[PDB]
Amino acid sequence: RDPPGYRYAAAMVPTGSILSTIEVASHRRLFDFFARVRSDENSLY
Amino acid sequence: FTAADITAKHRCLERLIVETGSAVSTATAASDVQFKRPPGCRELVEDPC
Amino acid sequence: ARHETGGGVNFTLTQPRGNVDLGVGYTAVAATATVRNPVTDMGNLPQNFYLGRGAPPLLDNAAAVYLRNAVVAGNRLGPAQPLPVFGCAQVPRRAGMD
Amino acid sequence: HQPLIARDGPHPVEQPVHNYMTKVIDRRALNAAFSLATEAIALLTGEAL
Amino acid sequence: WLVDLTTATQPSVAVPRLTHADTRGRPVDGVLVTTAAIKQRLLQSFLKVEDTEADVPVTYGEMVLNGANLVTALVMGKAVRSLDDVGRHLLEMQEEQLEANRETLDELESAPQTTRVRADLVAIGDRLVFLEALEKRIYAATNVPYP
Amino acid sequence: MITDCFEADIAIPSGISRPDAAALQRCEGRVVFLPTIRRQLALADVAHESFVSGGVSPDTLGLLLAYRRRFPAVITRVLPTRIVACPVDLGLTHAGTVNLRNTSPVDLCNGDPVSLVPPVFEGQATDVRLESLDLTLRFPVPLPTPLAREIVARLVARGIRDLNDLNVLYYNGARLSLVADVQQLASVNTELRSLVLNMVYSITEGTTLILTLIPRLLALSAQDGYVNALLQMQSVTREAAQLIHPEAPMLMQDGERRLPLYEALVAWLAHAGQLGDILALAPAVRVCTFDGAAVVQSGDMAPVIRYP
Amino acid sequence: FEADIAIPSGISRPDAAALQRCEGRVVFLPTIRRQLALADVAHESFVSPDTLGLLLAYRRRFPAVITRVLPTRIVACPVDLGLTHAGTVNLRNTSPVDLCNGDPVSLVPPVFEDVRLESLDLTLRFPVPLPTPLAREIVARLVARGIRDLNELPDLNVLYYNGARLSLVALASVNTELRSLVLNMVYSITEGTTLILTLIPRLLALGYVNALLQMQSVTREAAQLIHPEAPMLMRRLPLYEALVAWLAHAGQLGDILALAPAVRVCTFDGAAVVQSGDMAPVIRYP
Amino acid sequence: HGQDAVCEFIATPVATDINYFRRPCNPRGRAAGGVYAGDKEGDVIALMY
Amino acid sequence: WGKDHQVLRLSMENAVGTVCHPSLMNIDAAVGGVNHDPVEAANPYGAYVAAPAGPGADMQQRFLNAWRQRLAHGRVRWVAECQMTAEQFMQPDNANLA
């Protein structure tokens, strides 16, 4: 497996919004790099 | 009966529901009677079974 | 691309593409509405195993040859030519279907 | 991101949760076949003129 | 029931390039695709066509590597979709302020040329929907079966 | 080009009726036996009247035996004044994709080698007769090689009955029957001698070890379902163990430095395993479709790549 | 001419390096086609066969030698077509036998001792490219070993090629893997030599053929017939229909056991002997 | 009333279940006709006899 | 009901190609595989057969006298199962399903 974490500097400037909101973790298998965070985390920085 | 298949599949439901619409037929409707499918072509079929 | 057969020069053309599902969750749904002609006739066709192979026979070549003939004979399915070792078993072809 | 709703105890408190994920493209193609005919090669080239 | 085809799915990201819409301007929210047979039965009785000719964008989009986004493809070995912006706003941001809701880079594109097109628009519940059966436009006297 | 295409030109005569000239354009990819590899032949050097001996028209068994004296060529293109063919024995095309046509009632598959047979089948002995020239063309029947190894075995074994039924096949469930026909004695003795020189040469002193292993086989076939499906209902070794109790020799002359089993197999392969090539001719062509399908149907043309 | 084999995405760091390790190794593709999937090449697509099964399937499929291996697709140049177009392709030894200059090279299933892609969960078994004089010997030894294991010898486990010792032993899986050849080789001989024994005493007809027969059988075959009939005996036997089913079976094993070459090695500005592990400049077109 | 249809009579065994007649049938006892046949030369007769 | 609205019939006599195949008396893959883990010894009262004892009369007394404790250890399997109702029989009450 090669799940490289997403790129926060780029995602700091998004191209377009999502619309629907759902619990995401309910279905994971659509994605590759999937991460949950509680309110903040150290590696973000 | 084949065990190695049932043990193989995963248990996520979110996924199976997607697949058992699009799953692949064991038989063929092009044969004269009915056959295991030739390796060539694939018939998407939905097995609720 | 370019290719040639029997003097005819084939030109095959490809374009590459890519897909992503930019929705999170189910973005599409299929629904079954009606039913057309059921393709497989709902018949009674028994299955012979004498097509099969990998079943150790019964020890007396008088009886095995007895059964095989006394079953496979005159059968909608069972082999026309006795099973070749490495060929493919073939099922009799019917004169016509309905 | 995900919203919250506060609650009374004695439910252990819940904190904001942020979901991060990435998707990966999948690659495809298309096909079509143009074939000419032999003599049609001669005429265009001019060989048969 | 048709109301339960349409309400069981979750709309995706909003890209405001598309802008498929009525001749009124109400945007089109979705698409149905049926056989030619089902399409009548729904149009005869169960559904009403709220509009006939739809407005549709013309051009595709284009992502070209011209510019500093090229060098990184060669030298750095990676690429970013529009780096001529992300690269920019990682400068101003480094100075000015913080605002949570921002100006989404995707938003600032100018609209494509939209023309008039003929397709049936139907309202199932609250949303307008292209209601379409392609097997004439496409698959007509081509031997490919209808998926 | 000369190594790739070396295209023989059967010249067509001057006076040909349009019923017969349009018969040739219906014969685009078929098989023509060039007697030599000249660049200029005639239809009288190709047709069935060229194929006859002095007063003696060959039967379907002997008509195989003079295919292999000639050069099988696929026709590529039929111009109004001449017919262009590519001989297989040199090299097919530049890129190498020629077209046959199934005159057989049998479909092909990708990768199947194509052996060609004289027109044996019932309702199939189809000779284009050019009445405005009196030239009949027996175009041969292309078949997959598990058929042509079986049909030639049917035709050889039927003539050996006549020195003192058999004429029905099955291929993919299609019952097809071949024509029961008279067979000449000069043609059969060429076939009969071609067996017994090749079979008896395939027997060596190591074969007396293997004949001891016959009652091992009937001991083994009653257990495995594979050997029970291998031997047959109608074999000979099932009867040739119950009459035959062999014993192996204990010592052999220089039996330490030689290999008894190894020398038998190579002497078997080079004389008996080769034998299906000896009675018939060799499949110098196999089918490699590019993009269409796995199966070329009957009557449809089939792309062609040379076969080692 | 060159075909592509698309790698499905989701390849790990070692599995993407695993396809890089097999640069010039042989691949069978079912039909010559521009796009083709990597499941078709894989060992899963062969269904599982033994070594009689793989020799059938190497005669239906179309061999391609892998050229440059890109991270998205594998580029394959087929031997029957594009090697009459492209002249020389490199090909890597995996055999323990050094390829000399100008050798007709066949390919053999790996009987001796196999890259598995874990992220994709399929195995790629490649054949072992050794020349045709050895290919007719090594299979004939391994069949002959299987008969002496059906009651060995001090010899027959050792081959010498080009001054080098070969070891077929290096086993109990191998003898059962190659077992369905052995049951065909034993059947194809013992049915053969009984039809000879049932037809020469049946006819022995003298035109000159019996004069050719019995003089060639003068203490050579008729003494071999009599010594067989001494270890034997001398209703109507179904003789003439047993010829047909044997000729259809005997002519079939000659094509499995032919092991025809595809590759000839015309080296130029290089060593006359390509070692094991190295690449060999390879042609199939004169 | 009108011109009189001319009956005919085909002798049959007494055993044959009437259920062969409770839905439209072929009198001959076996389905004839080219419609049912396949593509081969001998079919139409093969069905017949 | 068939496809086309025929009454169709299916019966025992069509079961032949399946049952009549010799493979039903194929076993060993079973017994060879059920004996993997060692199994106990019950009261081998039906599982054992002796050689005929010499005396005609005294034979049964020998029997009773030697087998007393053997019939008092457990209970005879094939007799105990006599009282199992079918519904009772399938339940995992009787370990003898396996």
From TrEMBL, chain D:
Name under which the protein is recorded: Major capsid protein
Organism: Human herpesvirus 2 (HHV-2)
Organism lineage: Viruses, Duplodnaviria, Heunggongvirae, Peploviricota, Herviviricetes
Automatic annotation (TrEMBL), chain H:
Name the record gives this protein: Major capsid protein
Organism for this UniProt entry: Human herpesvirus 2 (HHV-2)
Span within the parent record: 1179 to 1227 of 1374
